Ligand binder design. Structure first.
Ligand SMILES: Nc1ncnc2c1ncn2[C@@H]1O[C@H](COP(=O)(O)OP(=O)(O)OC[C@H]2O[C@@H](O)[C@H](O)[C@@H]2O)[C@@H](O)[C@H]1O
Ligand SMILES: Nc1ncnc2c1ncn2[C@@H]1O[C@H](COP(=O)(O)OP(=O)(O)OC[C@H]2O[C@@H](O)[C@H](O)[C@@H]2O)[C@@H](O)[C@H]1O
Ligand SMILES: [Zn+2]
Ligand SMILES: [Zn+2]
Ligand SMILES: [Zn+2]
Ligand SMILES: [Zn+2]
Lengths: 374, 374
């Protein structure tokens, strides 16, 4: 009838680097103790899944990527208590073991039981829940959501509102929370403040919303593509500056506009130079700059430490600084409240079989966000 | 009888770069509106006064340096209300105009009316209160304390406790507050935490005390001079590590000891490399590293931004992050309380006429702190 045993579905497998995804037939073993098996309803395509493909983000291959999705619980293993079959959920790429040095810390969120630091591409027990033909296939993070079914550990799953449109809230899985959290939890934006966001992409758009929910009073969005300027404005940016029309460094034109410099700056592109530029357009005495992302293959940036000496702060974070298991559920509750919208972000919805087409839209172009539906 | 007119005293003048101080006879004009004239009782010799000498710290010459001192008020100009003649005071190199964008900010302390950003070497009105023979001599910061008399603006002076030993509390003028504040106000050390302090000098010693007052539970002091290890221990460090005996990078031996890394790290040497090293020995998910000092002639440091992405913070500050006019007075009150001691810092007391000898002790050697008495 149901499941309590091996399943057979299609999943997008990466056998080799820089090769497309091969839609294959795989077997998904039943959940062991404290594991949960989920049937995917939708998964978004994020830059990091693409790194894996390039070999930039180094994790054991073949693998089953994806980490930004929402689904419905099919079956739960022994000792599980946070979810029940039928429950809407969101796989968590940043766990919440809830008892490490970091989980217990009032601010920390990068659970020690994560798998990006030193990826293993397995489950918490060190075995894989996947095989294609006779070959085991590795997990991605603790999610591997580019499969019709996946198994995740209980500290890597969040139970959400049962009324949740899983085709839209899947965003809270990475893209949206990463940006939004950077503003409201990491930089801890104050109201009346002036903010600058470098990069008007999806995560970028997310920050501008956090800055807005946060109460900010002025949000300058900066990008060298005039095209991205409308949604940003529509979603929250009060200004949009294209550094390509100025005849001077924009850190300069930025400090001039902010009359001393912005209160908080966000670098959501991942560029080294822009990393330093965003640092300097921040008010020298009490400005806070946040790095939302740095490519897995990033090199060292040159910086003058006198930049920090005045009184400036430089932070980083993963997953918008949010305690994953505790917060994901609340972001949904707020989305449900009518609080924020997620629609201006979804620019494309494709059937899951057309994954490689999703990556093309992504890889080169403008597709703010492509959602793969199962 | 008294003063309400020009005074004639000796001051240590720097006519040219990399030339010793020449004890000369200068005339100190009476305080104009909102100025205060102070008779120096003692002034400490700090690294930054020496930068000036080297040309590293670029300010208009000839000048009358010094900025770390305490004294007694002789006469006050028009509109003055915070001090009365006879009052013990401490000149403030970081003003508190009390009404700028930064003074009004709940955290900011680098008043916009300071003179290190773009030094003028004058008073707030843009004229000099000094002349040697017929030649005007420039001010240093808004202090110029290497004179038997000096004139400072009212936002650059702090009224302290009348019972205050001015030969010891002069420290609160730079050295002590710069370190102490870095721990208790900038990093905002929490109790039970583990801290690491790179540099076991005077300011360095000051941080270890702030970390201690702060409630910390473990303070590793690191320096490549076994000699500095006793006072540090005596003043607060629970451990002292000399990176020269290890066969591995100490960021490594540091993370090993802290089992993940220290909660807060302080770089009080001013070295680029050590700047990066201190950043990495901090707990990756929620570690906070503070730069207490960077030489005026510092170059760019190479750094991998992935260091910040985990969740680490990097701050800087000037004058221990303290709102100068508001806080100096309290540090004295606390010192008076019997709270902390300032004695283990003063390693030498010389008569003011032997200034150049003070710089020698400083320039090359071990003299934790040399106090010049008038
Ligand atoms: N030199 C530049 N100056 C300004 N804007 C730039 C520059 N180079 C690129 N951009 C802009 O930055 C944006 C990049 O975002 P996307 O490519 O659309 O990707 P997004 O998902 O929004 O951000 C991905 C980035 O953020 C990090 O979290 C992640 O690691 C990755 O580095 C685009 O709007 C692009 O025009
Ligand atoms: N590579 C190194 N590793 C470890 N310790 C070092 C190293 N190089 C120097 N030190 C130690 O750092 C200390 C330097 O402090 P001092 O020279 O005594 O000067 P201090 O006043 O304590 O600090 C001055 C420094 O701090 C900044 O606020 C200021 O701008 C200046 O750069 C000494 O104990 C010295 O042995
Ligand atoms: Zn944990
Ligand atoms: Zn992602
Ligand atoms: Zn001010
Ligand atoms: Zn000083």
């Amino acid at each position: 009838s149901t499941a309590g045993k091996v399943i057979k579905c299609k999943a997008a497998v990466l056998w080799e680097e820089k090769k497309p995804f091969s839609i294959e037939e795989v077997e998904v073993a039943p959940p062991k103790a404290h594991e949960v098996r989920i049937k995917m309803v939708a998964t978004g395509i994020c830059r990091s899944d693409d790194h894996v493909v390039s070999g930039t983000l180094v994790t054991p291959l073949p693998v089953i990527a994806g980490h930004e999705a929402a689904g419905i619980v099919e079956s739960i293993g022994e000792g599980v208590t946070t979810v029940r079959p039928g429950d809407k959920v969101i796989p968590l790429f940043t766990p919440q073991c809830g008892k490490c040095r970091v989980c217990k810390h009032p601010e920390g969120n990068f659970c020690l039981k994560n798998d990006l630091s030193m990826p293993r591409g397995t489950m918490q027990d060190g075995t894989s829940r996947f095989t294609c033909r006779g070959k085991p296939i590795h997990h991605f993070l603790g999610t591997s959501t580019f499969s019709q079914y996946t198994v995740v550990d209980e500290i890597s799953v969040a139970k959400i509102d049962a009324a949740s449109p899983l085709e839209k809230v899947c965003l809270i899985g990475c893209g949206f929370s990463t940006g939004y959290g950077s503003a409201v939890k990491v930089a801890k934006v104050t109201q009346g403040s002036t903010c600058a966001v470098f990069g008007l992409g999806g995560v970028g758009l997310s920050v501008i919303m956090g800055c807005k929910a946060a109460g900010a009073a002025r949000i300058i969005g900066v990008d060298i593509n005039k095209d991205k300027f409308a949604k940003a404005k529509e979603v929250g940016a009060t200004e949009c500056v294209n550094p390509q029309d100025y005849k001077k460094p924009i850190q300069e034109v930025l400090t001039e506009m902010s009359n001393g410099g912005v209160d908080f700056s966000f670098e959501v592109i991942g560029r080294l130079d822009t990393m330093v530029t965003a640092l300097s357009c921040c008010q020298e005495a009490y400005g806070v700059s946040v790095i939302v992302g740095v490519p897995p293959d990033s090199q060292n940036l040159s910086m003058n430490p006198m930049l920090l000496l005045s009184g400036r702060t430089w932070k980083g974070a993963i997953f918008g600084g949010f305690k994953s298991k505790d917060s994901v559920p609340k972001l949904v509750a707020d989305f449900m409240a009518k609080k924020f919208a997620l629609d201006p972000l979804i620019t494309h919805v494709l059937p899951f079989e057309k994954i490689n087409e999703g990556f093309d839209l992504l890889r080169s172009g403008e597709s703010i966000r492509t959602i793969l539906t199962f």
